[PDB]
DNA sequence: AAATTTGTCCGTATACATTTT
DNA sequence: TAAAATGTATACGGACAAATT
């Protein structure tokens, strides 16, 4: 019964994607609407966590996934960037 | 190296929790209180008796399997190598 | 069967290490 | 130089997945 995110139990079609996946969708949206152009910086990990209201590890999980599929690349001490 | 309780003239340190668990388990083995192919206490038992999280237990045990002191069988249990 | 037990996923918190800037 | 930003380590919690017993 894949946990995902659940607001409530009863009836229907059930509930939301995990937090990190929601974050993934948002970031990937920024890239694919071109609000963030190739080689440009995404708002940082700290910033991201303050705006999304999630842990740094949730942010890092989303970003890491997006790096693995090659949409982002990150530079230690530098920042994170559009691929 | 990682832990403390902060006081003057120096700083008081202790091993991280998982390290303490490691020492305990490995001492059980090296004193022969547990013999090859015998199972150690379950991760659940260990967390309840040591008062730490299942991940602290799993971390210690993981380090001890990497050394070949232990081996675990999923659904089976954990054993002295 | 179905309960135990170990394995992995998801989420949170704090501290410190490593590089850039 | 330090500050900032990413990386890894140490904890904790809950829920689910997989294989044994």
Swiss-Prot record, chain A:
The chain holds residues 1 to 68 of 362 of the full protein. Disulfide bonds: none annotated. Coiled coil: none annotated. This is Arabinose metabolism transcriptional repressor. Residues 45-64 bind DNA. Transcriptional repressor of the arabinose utilization genes. Also regulates its own expression. Binds to two sequences within the promoters of the araABDLMNPQ-abfA operon and the araE gene, and to one sequence in the araR promoter. The lineage of its organism: Bacteria, Bacillati, Bacillota, Bacilli, Bacillales. Residues 16-83 form the HTH gntR-type domain. It is found in: Cytoplasm. It comes from Bacillus subtilis (strain 168). It comes from the Bacteria. Signal peptide: none annotated.
């Amino acid at each position: 019964h894949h946990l995902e995110v659940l607001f409530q139990g009863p009836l229907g079609s059930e509930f939301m994607l995990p937090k990190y996946a929601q974050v993934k969708e948002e970031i990937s949206s920024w890239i694919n609407q071109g609000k963030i152009l190739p080689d440009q910086k995404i708002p940082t990990e700290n910033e991201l966590m303050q705006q999304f209201g999630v842990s740094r590890h949730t942010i890092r999980k989303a970003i890491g996934d997006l790096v693995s599929q090659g949409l982002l690349y990150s530079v230690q001490g530098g920042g994170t960037f559009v691929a």
